[PDB]
Amino acid sequence: DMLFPVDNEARQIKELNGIWKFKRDNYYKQGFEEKWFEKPLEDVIDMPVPSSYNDITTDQELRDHVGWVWYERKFAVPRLWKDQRLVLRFGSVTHHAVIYLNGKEITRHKGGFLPFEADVTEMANEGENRLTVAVGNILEWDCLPVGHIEYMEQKFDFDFFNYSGIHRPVRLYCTPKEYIEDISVRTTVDDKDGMVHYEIKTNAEEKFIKVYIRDEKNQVVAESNEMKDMVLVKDAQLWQPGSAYLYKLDIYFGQDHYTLPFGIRTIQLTEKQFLINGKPFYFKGFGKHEDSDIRGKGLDEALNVRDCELLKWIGANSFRTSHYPYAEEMMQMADQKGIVVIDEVPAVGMNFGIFTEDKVNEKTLAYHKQVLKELYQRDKNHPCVVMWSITNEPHSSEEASRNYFEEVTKYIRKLDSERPITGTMNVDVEEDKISQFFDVVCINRYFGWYVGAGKIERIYPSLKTDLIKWHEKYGKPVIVTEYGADTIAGLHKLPEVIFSEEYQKRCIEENNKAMDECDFVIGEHIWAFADFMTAFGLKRVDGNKKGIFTRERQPKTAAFAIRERWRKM
Amino acid sequence: DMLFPVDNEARQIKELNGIWKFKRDNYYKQGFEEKWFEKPLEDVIDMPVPSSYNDITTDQELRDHVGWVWYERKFAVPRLWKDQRLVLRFGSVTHHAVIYLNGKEITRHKGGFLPFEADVTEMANEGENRLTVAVGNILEWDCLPVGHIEYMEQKFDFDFFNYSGIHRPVRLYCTPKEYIEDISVRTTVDDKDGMVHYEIKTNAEEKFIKVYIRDEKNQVVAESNEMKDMVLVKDAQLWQPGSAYLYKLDIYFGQDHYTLPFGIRTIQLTEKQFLINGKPFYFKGFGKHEDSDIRGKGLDEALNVRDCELLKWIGANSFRTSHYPYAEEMMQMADQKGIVVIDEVPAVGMNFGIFTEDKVNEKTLAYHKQVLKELYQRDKNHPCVVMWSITNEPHSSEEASRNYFEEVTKYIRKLDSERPITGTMNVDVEEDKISQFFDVVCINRYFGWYVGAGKIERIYPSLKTDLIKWHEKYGKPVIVTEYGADTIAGLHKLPEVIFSEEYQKRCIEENNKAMDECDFVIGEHIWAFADFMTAFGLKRVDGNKKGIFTRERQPKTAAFAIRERWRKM
Ligand SMILES: [Ca+2]
Ligand SMILES: [Ca+2]
Secondary structure (H helix, E strand, O other), X not given: OOOOOOOOOOOEEEEOOOEEEEEEOOOOOHHHHOOHHHOOOOOOEEXXXXXXXXXXXXXXXXXOOOOEEEEEEEEEEOHHHOOOEEEEEEOOOEOEEEEEEOOEEXXXXXXXXXXXXXXXXXXXXXXXXXXXXXXXXXXXXXXXXXXXXXXXXXXXXXXXXXXXXXXXXEEEXXXXXXXXXXXXXXXXXXXXXXXXXXXXXXXXXXXXXXXEEEOOOOOEEEEEOOOXXXXXXXXXXXXXXXXXXXXXXXXXXXXXXXEEEEOOOOEEEXXXXXXXXXXXOOEEEEEOOOOEOOOEOOOOHHHHHHHHHHHHHOOOOEEEOOOOOOOHHHHHHHHHHOOEEEEEOOOEOOOOOXXXXXXXXXXXXXXXXXXXXXXXXXXXXXXOEEEEEEEEOOOOOOOHHHHHHHXXXXXXXXXXXXXXXXXXXXXXXXXXXXXXXXXXXXXXXXXXXXXXXXOHHHHHHHXXXXXXXXXXXXXXXXXXXXXXXXXXXXXXXOOOOOEOHHHHHXXXXXXXXXXXXXXOEEEEEEOOOEOEOEOOOOOOOOOEOOOOEOOOOXXXXXXXHHHHHHHHO | OOOOOOOOOOOEEEEOOOEEEEEEOOOOOHHHHOOHHHOOOOOOEEEEOOEEOOOOOOOHHHHOOOOEEEEEEEEEEXXXXXXXXXXXXXXXXXXXXXXXXXOEEEEEEEOOOOOEEEEOOOOOOOEEEEEEEEEEOOOOOOOOOOOEEEOOEEEOOOOOOOOOEEOOOEXXXXXXXXXXXXXXXXXXXXXXXXXXXXXXEEOOOOOOEEEEEEOOOOOEXXXXXXOEEEEEEOOOOOOEOOEOOOEEEEEEEOOEEXXXXXXXXXXXXXXXXXXXXXXXXXXXXXXXXXXEOOOXXXXXXXXXXXXXXXXXXXXXXXXXXXXXXXXXXXHHHHHHHOOEEEEEOOOEOOOOOOOOOOOOOHHHHHHHHHHHHHHHHHHOOOOOEEEEEEEEOOOOOOOHHHXXXXXXXXXXXXXXXXXXXEXXXXXXXXXXXXXXXXXXXXXXXXXXXXXXXXXXXXXXXXXXHHHHHHHHHXXXXXXXXXXXXXXXXXXXXXXXXXXXXXXXXXXXXXXXXXXHOOOOEEEEEEOOOEOEOOOOOXXXXXXXXXXXXXOOOOEOOHHHHHHHHHHOO
16 A cells, blocks of 8 residues: 555645754664664764665765664654544555654664655654664665675665665655545547546445545536446546646545545557557656765655656657666656656666576566566556666576566556556666566667777667567567767867767767667667766766766756757657 | 743653645735635645755745745644643744744744744644744834845845755644743852842743752752742852763752753953853854755755864864854753853944935844844853853944944843853954954954955965054954855965965965954954855855855865864864
8 A cells, every 4th residue: 555645625744854864874784783762863864855875974984884874853743633543654665664753663664765654643642753764775686686795785786876875755644534545547439438437445345435626727527436347437637748737536534534646548559659648758867866066865856856847858758767766756747747757666786697596586486576566566556667677787687587477567567457567778788588578678879988988980780680680580679779979078078089079969860760660669768968976987977977968957068959859759 | 931841750841843735926915815724735745844945946936936925734632732831833944934823824034044943822723723934024114134125135244155945853742831931140250259240030920939959960959948049059160161060950940840951151251351150261163053955954864963073073162153142042052062152142234325215224123132132042051151242344434333232232232140241253454343342343254255365375475463452453362253255175376376275375374463462352254164155146156155164064174274273282
């Protein structure tokens, strides 16, 4: 159960963000061994929430910390909340969490990009309470993303910096004691009329319920007293790429009230095309990252609006939540703005034998299924999500990866029968062993950068040849999910050279020429949207510089050429 | 009454931030004349709150908008708030506001940097309500900051971009119907003993009250049943620069409860020293701004923590709120971190005859006193505030300005008899006509930049001479409140040139040599803390580049030489 918290006459949200008190372990698990949670934290600094902690201070030891840190603040339960159900919700804690309330452990969570909560109805006191949160950043072979510890040094083979902290809002909220627990909505369209199938779960299934479907002007277009039903919406306003329309499932249950936005739209994959509402859709966009200056991966809604303005300005129609689920506020924004989304779990870093019993094994596999279940439960009702990505660049040349990903793909297909399934490729087409389980083949190709760096004339023939091989081996439509080139803003050269602004434009141009000659390509996603931070390395100039925009969300030269192309499509 | 809202067993806060709907006027006052507030806004975009609106979109017409824009969202009143007093608070609206609730005007406000509120107990409905806010950015001769309209173009003489929007949190909060309205605290010290003078004002003064003073471990150290009292704090932990201690005035009144943090510390001025708790204090720090990428002047608490970390790293002990009051969050942070603050009113831009019947006149004067009253009411109880600055660089060579600022200084002295009063100078010392009214003389001087650009060897003789003149004319201690040089990060040259990193360092050094030879100098504030945005001009390379740090809060070369000086001082 993970309905996004709401405010109305019956439910209320208390934000617990702001400035917390903060302290890091000075040796491994110092805070657990010394039971720091038993009393208020001492010798602390201020830390903002939501935000990563790595980039806030001037202290390299905190930036490079491996292990656990400790957050604490106080919150109040109002007298007016006397007989309500009380829930403490964490949008995320990266990567591992132990939650304490007034010195007592109340829940734990594993995985840094999905929300979790704890019912504290019978444990919070009226008035002041103390909330203590332990935050661990260690990744092992059974975490997603994958990593491992060497002797303590953290190892991993994904790009982005392993930021840690409380990256999403913390919320204490209240509901009545009999209440709506979960909602699932599915839609179909028969010519001009839409059919809304819904299922509502409550903790008193025998009690009366009233369910409205309201349109965008909030007028009732359908009505029912069933917990599960199938209601017709005549002349349905469809949710379309670039023109969102959102209905509302408005539910009254006893004293409870919940309103759920949703969209009516169909997805159908053909030979060679990706149909949305029966019309072909060509992905134009980026894989993104949750990353900006100072705050690391902290949610920043102002930055989120600026990014959507940028996506609109440049003619993009989609993005992929590259390498982990994003904040729901961004998923909600994509629903409202009509932006098409590929939603991805953090199965990244399964690459360098990786699929062995001592590394990525059945323990990893079972956790991977759990993350997919948690992702599906959070995002199942978003019309913006049109496809699930279950992995980014696994070492899928290994024979052992075949049974691994057949199992993951079949699990996600049972949870959701309506949305296509995918995963992104980096191994050579001849050696790949899993893409036959997918509905769409997604490839990350860096011709002109990681292959034949600087050789502009080799980009077009190399990509076209590889594209044709992927189509011929699997017979499915293809998206190029990553391609591009590192580019230092202000570095100009004539003739162009790698890292120059001119080279990034030409590299992308030549890849685009290959894709334009292939009738089976259904998308191009440039890597990356914006410069972002990476673990330190000699190929990373203060992070990954493949951004079309700088980290401060201003365009490099190539942005203007991309805009001309995407806007005339 | 402007007590900062609090959460406890009796009072509750609902934040109304997030993503609002937004639309600008297409001609002057269009929304007022078409009565847009009467129905939900149509043809809208998303706009984050808190944030400026100017740097969010890709649209030049909005960035440079002159006039009014319109914000709207919905909010809920829960059933559980049924019998409470309901208050809508705006931390600020820049510059002018008209607030509508369910299509009816409920308040207005002039002034972009101080909070205001509206009692909505009788007008808000249970459940859903519609909040509409018109936001105007026009500055006239009786506004602060000062500006004027020409033919529609906005003119002004201050040097920072005229960002507009809802820069600080919007809060709906509840209290009991009989409640604590205002609190004032003054402190004296007697050897090791504090005396806390307090005065509590309520909604029903004949009822009984309980007042505790609590230390930082929450332990009662004094107690009383009076609304107005002095209570002794023996072995009182003093609030010290760089080592803060905050007691809490904990007040119970009927069903109401309010806890006010405060500090015990004294201020005294001699003709050469600024004494805090009897010890000389030398100001080391910066005038700042509320400015960052994307969000303009929007509150960003993660940015505030990073700034305070950088102030600590560089050995700064103070800042001035150039040129307007900052968010209360930043004032609380200064209270907790032991940072000393010069608190400044937005009386900036009274420069180019300025003090004439048609420009800065009796209306400007009366408004100037009003903003000082409002600033005092908000910040009176902050130990971090050691001095009020009533103006920045007025054209105080005009004879007419004498009576103007005698009025202003008399007025603020009536509100606050303990804190020193000042205002910053740019006119020639021989021409000034007001600084005799101040307790400390503050001068903005840019020898090596605006006077004798590039002539390093003339900086030290020029500032020493000017300093001695200011001291000779007024016989008061002197703070140099601004000095420095524009500096493009990455610009290096040997020998150094203006705009280079090396020149900024040498220019500050030579100015510091002059100050080190003047015993009556009690502070040095470099301009600026961080690069910030200005109105467009040929001297402003994408804004003001006098930052010691970049706009993204990283140090230029001069930061490390400043740190060496300030950390060994
Ligand atoms: Ca969230
Ligand atoms: Ca505020």
